[PDB]
RNA sequence: ACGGAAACUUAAAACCGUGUUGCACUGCAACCCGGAAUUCUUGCACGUCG
């Protein structure tokens, strides 16, 4: 299980960033990089916002 | 001392005067600046309480 290694605030929480583009962006077009906005596979489901209540 | 010997066919005079290369005539009739392209794909108002 991967950790959040670092002493300063710049490198405490940063492993939520560099791991979020490792096994999560695998759509794999032959002309675009994986590690950006296009090649995501987490764009599968499409959330609809909840209605208004009392 | 040859019907011989002398003599300019000569002087002047404007081929000039009147007269539009002119009058009628569309550079005109017909046409689309017209057809096919997602403003898009990654993203939690939250860490923080002796």
């Amino acid at each position: 299980p991967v950790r959040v290694p670092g002493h300063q605030t710049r490198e405490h929480r940063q492993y939520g960033e560099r791991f979020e583009r490792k096994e999560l962006r695998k759509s794999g077009r032959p002309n675009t990089r994986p590690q950006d906005a296009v090649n995501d596979l987490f764009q599968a489901i499409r959330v609809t916002d909840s209605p208004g209540l009392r």
Side-chain angles (χ1 to χ4, degrees):
Chain A
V2 289
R3 323 174 272 261
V4 285
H7 262 298
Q8 42 269 30
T9 299
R10 194 262 305 161
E11 56 183 340
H12 278 289
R13 268 169 54 171
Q14 50 174 57
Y15 213 76
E17 190 170 43
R18 80 169 58 197
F19 200 58
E20 210 192 6
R21 310 307 201 277
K22 189 180 173 189
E23 309 101 327
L24 296 80
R25 318 297 194 111
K26 292 186 304 269
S27 276
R29 285 148 204 276
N31 44 3
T32 309
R33 301 287 100 97
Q35 275 91 18
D36 71 86
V38 179
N39 285 256
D40 196 5
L41 67 101
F42 273 32
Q43 53 184 306
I45 64 172
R46 296 295 150 101
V47 158
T48 287
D49 188 87
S50 51
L53 309 188
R54 42 194 182 185

